[PDB]
Amino acid sequence: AKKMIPIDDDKLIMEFKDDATAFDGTKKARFKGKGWLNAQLSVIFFKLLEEHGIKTHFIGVAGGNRLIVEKLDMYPLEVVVRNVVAGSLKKRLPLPEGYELPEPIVELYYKNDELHDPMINYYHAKVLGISLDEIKKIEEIALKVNEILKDYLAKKGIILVDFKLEFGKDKNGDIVLADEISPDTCRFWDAKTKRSLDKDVFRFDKGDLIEAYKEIYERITGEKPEF
Amino acid sequence: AKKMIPIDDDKLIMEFKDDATAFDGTKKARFKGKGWLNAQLSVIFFKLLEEHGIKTHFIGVAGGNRLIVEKLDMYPLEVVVRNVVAGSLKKRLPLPEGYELPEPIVELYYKNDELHDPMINYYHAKVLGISLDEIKKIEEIALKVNEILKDYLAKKGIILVDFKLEFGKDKNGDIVLADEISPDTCRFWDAKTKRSLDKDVFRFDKGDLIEAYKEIYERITGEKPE
Ligand SMILES: Nc1ncnc2c1ncn2[C@@H]1O[C@H](COP(=O)(O)OP(=O)(O)O)[C@@H](O)[C@H]1O
Ligand SMILES: Nc1ncnc2c1ncn2[C@@H]1O[C@H](COP(=O)(O)OP(=O)(O)O)[C@@H](O)[C@H]1O
Ligand SMILES: Nc1ncnc2c1ncn2[C@@H]1O[C@H](COP(=O)(O)O)[C@@H](O)[C@H]1O
Ligand SMILES: Nc1ncnc2c1ncn2[C@@H]1O[C@H](COP(=O)(O)O)[C@@H](O)[C@H]1O
């Protein structure tokens, strides 16, 4: 759902598309406005994190659905942080969907579509060339990010249930938060009703996608989506 | 503003009074309902914390303004946690009142009225007989308590600006959260307006005390104070 367009050796344009894809592309659709919503939400989040001293790849905006980002040497990881039991965590722990976890959980997955993104631990990560030291930096950043996003969204009646992050190395060798932060890459639930306000609405046809994404945007900004 | 009444070698009664005192007792008053409100708010906070596995001195209630607590060998400390610049932090950092800190700040004060509770570091703590190991336990508990209280209050439109905790050792030698947790010992601001809902209302005559404390209570319980 993104187009990455190289500017040069140190920066690129991340363009958000209106395509919605799930279950390995066996389920596809297009939602007018999704790209714009996701881009804008990414901006909001990256700036919010940046304000707390989190280093992110965000440089600026170049149109409604286009972000300018620093080019990174990417870690071959999905870094997942989980506050409430949902999705695949139900297959790992003996706990009901909706269960509030006493502490956030960080899972690492190997970014590899052919292997369908398997979960890995610190030993696997070393084999893939990621030192124990980098891993603990990554996890520390991820937990910090989790706390800022969770607390921000909670004040607006949104539960941050879980989410996926990606990281890379910049020119200086610092670890930098990358990719996107949107309802495509997080589970957001309404605090009162516990309805999904994210891609699960598409994955399991539980409602109107553009509607839920608008709802997130409206709650955060206090303003109906422009486009 | 509290009366500590020994039951035996392991328990005591903490009684909350309606007396309000500030600036070393040079500014005193009484507010009908304060003790009750403070006691009840302490109950709510201690049980909330106990629900997260924080060990506290809270045993139970013995009337509207009386708590039954475990007797502890107390650390001679105020352990202050700060999320938002206010009060004496303005005199330490070059930052405006209301400034949101990137991380929470933990400060240690030596509990001693004659010295007016001076700030200390880990070296002073050791002199006062507190090991580096205890200090880090204390600080890890304080940071935990901060995150639970801050998140809980935030959902209710209350900013946990800063607060003071006290700790003691029980029979087993575990570190136990003690004293009280009320608008007497924390700074609470309304999220929208940023007005004080705590003892700063009394300290600096910025409004009606019983009103602000009731506000806190009502927001937390969803019910007017009984
Ligand atoms: N700052 C960055 N530098 C280099 N690569 C990035 C950066 N941010 C994201 N990427 C990578 O670009 C790709 C974004 O493509 P996307 O549309 O999310 O689909 P896919 O996961 O199929 O690649 C991902 O591979 C992501 O890891
Ligand atoms: N569980 C406990 N066991 C023993 N002492 C405690 C416990 N909780 C609080 N204390 C102490 O009881 C005293 C109550 O003091 P208080 O009346 O609040 O005013 P001050 O702090 O000015 O003495 C304090 O010295 C406090 O440190
Ligand atoms: N490949 C991916 N792309 C986008 N988001 C993901 C991906 N993998 C996991 N997530 C997010 O990570 C969280 C946990 O997902 P799951 O492991 O499917 O239960 C959810 O918020 C997902 O949206
Ligand atoms: N001696 C004390 N009694 C009660 N509360 C205190 C005391 N010292 C500090 N605090 C609390 O800790 C926070 C920081 O206080 P200060 O350093 O005075 O700005 C405030 O919320 C105070 O209410």
Curated annotation (Swiss-Prot), chain B:
Xref: PROSITE patterns: SAICAR_SYNTHETASE_1, SAICAR_SYNTHETASE_2
Keyword annotations: ATP-binding, Ligase, Nucleotide-binding, Purine biosynthesis
Enzyme's top EC category: ligase
Record's keyword annotation contains Protease: no
Domain of life the protein comes from: Archaea
Similarity-based family: Belongs to the SAICAR synthetase family.
Protein known as: Phosphoribosylaminoimidazole-succinocarboxamide synthase
Originating organism: Pyrococcus horikoshii (strain ATCC 700860 / DSM 12428 / JCM 9974 / NBRC 100139 / OT-3)
